[PDB]
């Protein structure tokens, strides 16, 4: 039985799993966010990718498709056809709700780049059906990467809210086969998020459930999940001190009991300790 | 002694280490290329990073700095100062020679993106001293990622050549503490490169020595390099058949004896430690 491990790397050298950005802090969600349903950065502890999560960061928050000046008909990132009515979106498709996207579009075999501005709210945005509005992108084949974000066009005047995912479906049909929501199962526990600074006209922090390098590590190791939760220490590499105990659950997320965690340094390393009960009572981070 | 491993993942799901691009094939270098001196994608087999190589793809082929309209004063990606006369460039700085760069520049706290066009040949391109010409980028702080490439502006008419690295130094002083060159070890062996299609007005293929996910794997495992070379099988996931024998060397590269026609959906598996001069059987035979 292969033992369960996490990478022997400090958080500050790793990447967000919802955009190709360095991790800059650890945080918890605001009081009004209890569950989340991210579609990227979703990996079980025995290495099963769900949602649109790819193995590699080179696929994260990217699109690929053919514009006819009216819609972009999406494919997978390698050009493989994307079939409608099966999943939320192609592998790697951006999952940032609560904002407008600005995607940098390039082409194989042609010069220059084009900014593609995406409102994710209207009925023409239907990646579940393989199609999204072109919004002025001329005909051709493109690959795009998320470049910056701005406040959502609708509802007018609302703020950026990166705890959300976009509406992959439409009034024609709801999207199917999304990755399910995650919630903190233990007493006094809250979800733990890895945060990155996102370019745009505000102080944007993108949360994710797991660094991308954790995902490729788990997808490779495929260690059997022999227990109900993975007890972890967050370890300071300078002193070797245990800065707090955490629990990782098999669906692929971490929890803690806040004192706090948001004020933890980013240069630490998560180390597996042992398998514990789902209801192991964590002591508050710090206290 | 922690055993040596490579990721249990197929190559086609991994990324280039010189730009954030999917791997699409295996290749070898042309006859006119004897050595390569890539600065990104450089990692020993016991996990030691060299050159500008970062742990994570989120740093690869990026720049960070403040323009004064005349130069960009470079920093590390997190804003940490980069001191002159120490290394080639900050961590993650693009290492594609033989081309002009087009970098997508964005800002924390501001709207929009700006295309930054970089000639790497002139005397103002001196990342080793912490600065490169602004070429019209207005004053401010930016983070930028390589977006597409084109033929180099100088010498006029030359083609894109991604086997090269840029000139990090100047005619005043050479750049120091570069990752050293890698050479074909002999015995009919050639270096193995992982290739990615790179956007631009040509059929550009970007070679690198190691997928980025191998680098973060070795940097984490830090397995002692117990032998002179690591014998590998490239294994087909369908049949399990061994598609070819390879050797990975402690300086962090693979060789084979002829690869370009190999399928990209296989997995490299460590077999055993062997001698530096262990004779490989030709790929296929």
């Amino acid at each position: 039985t292969r033992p369960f491990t996490l990478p022997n790397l400090p958080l500050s050298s790793l990447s967000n799993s919802r955009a190709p950005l360095p991790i800059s802090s650890i945080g918890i969600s605001p009081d009004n966010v209890q569950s989340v349903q991210f579609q990227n950065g979703r990996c079980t502890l025995d290495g099963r990718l769900v949602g649109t999560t790819p193995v590699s960061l080179s696929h994260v928050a990217k699109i690929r498709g053919t514009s006819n000046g009216t819609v972009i008909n999406l494919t997978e990132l390698d050009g493989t056809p994307f079939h409608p009515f099966e999943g939320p979106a192609p592998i790697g498709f951006p999952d940032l709700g609560g904002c407008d996207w600005h995607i940098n579009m390039t082409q194989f075999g042609h010069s220059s780049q084009t900014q593609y501005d995406v409102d994710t709210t209207p009925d023409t945005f239907v990646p579940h059906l393989g199609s999204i509005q072109a919004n002025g992108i001329g005909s051709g084949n493109y690959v795009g990467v998320l470049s910056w974000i701005s406040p959502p066009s609708h509802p007018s005047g609302s703020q950026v809210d990166l705890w959300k995912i976009p509406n992959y479906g439409s009034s024609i049909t709801e999207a199917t086969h999304l990755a399910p929501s995650v919630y903190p199962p233990g007493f006094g526990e809250v979800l733990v998020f890895f945060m990155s600074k996102m370019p745009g006209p505000g102080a944007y922090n993108l949360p994710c459930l797991l660094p991308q390098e954790y995902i490729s590590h788990l997808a490779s190791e495929q260690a059997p999940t022999v227990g109900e939760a993975a007890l972890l220490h967050y370890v300071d590499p300078d002193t070797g001190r245990n800065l707090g105990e955490f629990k990782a659950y098999p669906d692929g997320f971490l929890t803690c009991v806040p004192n706090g965690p948001q004020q933890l340094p980013i240069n630490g390393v998560f180390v597996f300790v042992s398998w514990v009960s789902r209801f192991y009572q964590l002591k508050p981070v710090g206290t | 002694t922690r055993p040596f491993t490579l990721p249990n993942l197929p190559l086609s799901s991994l990324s280039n280490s010189r730009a954030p691009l999917p791997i699409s094939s295996i290749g070898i270098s042309p006859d006119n290329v004897q050595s390569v001196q890539f600065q990104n994608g450089r990692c020993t087999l016991d996990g030691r990073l060299v050159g500008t190589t970062p742990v994570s793809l989120s740093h690869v082929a990026k720049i960070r700095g403040t323009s004064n309209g005349t130069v960009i004063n470079l920093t590390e990606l997190d804003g940490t100062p980069f001191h002159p006369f120490e290394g080639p460039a900050p961590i993650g700085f693009p290492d594609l020679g033989g081309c002009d760069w087009h970098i997508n520049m964005t800002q924390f706290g501001h709207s929009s993106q700006t295309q930054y066009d970089v000639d790497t040949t002139p005397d103002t391109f001196v990342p080793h001293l912490g600065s490169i010409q602004a070429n019209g980028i207005g004053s401010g702080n930016y983070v930028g990622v390589l977006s597409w490439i084109s033929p180099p502006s100088h010498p006029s008419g030359s083609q894109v050549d991604l086997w090269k690295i840029p000139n990090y130094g100047s005619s005043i002083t050479e750049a120091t503490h570069l990752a050293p060159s890698v050479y074909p070890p002999g015995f009919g062996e050639v270096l193995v490169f992982f290739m990615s299609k790179m956007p631009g007005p040509g059929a550009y293929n970007l070679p690198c020595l190691l997928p980025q996910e191998y680098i973060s794997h070795l940097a984490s495992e830090q397995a002692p390099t117990v032998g002179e070379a690591a014998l590998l099988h490239y294994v087909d996931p369908d049949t399990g058949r061994n598609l070819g024998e390879f050797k990975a060397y402690p300086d962090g590269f693979l060789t084979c004896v002829p690869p370009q026609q190999l399928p990209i959906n296989g997995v490299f598996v460590f077999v055993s430690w062997v001698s530096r001069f262990y004779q490989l059987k030709p790929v296929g035979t």
Partner: nanobody
Amino acid sequence: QVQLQESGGGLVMTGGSLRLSCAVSGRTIDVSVMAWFRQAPGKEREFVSGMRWSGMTTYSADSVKDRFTISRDKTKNTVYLQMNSLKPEDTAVYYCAARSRFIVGVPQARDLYDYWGQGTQVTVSS
């Protein structure tokens, strides 16, 4: 996430034939192995047959190797189990199973599979 839906079970006479089918939906892009398992009363769940979803390789248990056949529909995302020359010993609940995590070959261990169907009952009467 992947959804498996079996159909095709029922009552069959000894020596007859029957074809089970499993409709595979959801994140099928990186499904690598599809397989059939069966569990008889009082016995443990056993591997019947499996195939590389996008490859050629197949593998079947010895006790069914010359009688059962697994295949994938050339059109839809459906895997079939063709059961010929059935015997009363073949009576069981037949389960469809999928593995998406990377692996070399066709595994036979029930614990290595990632998704399971609800099972379809097959009764071979004498």
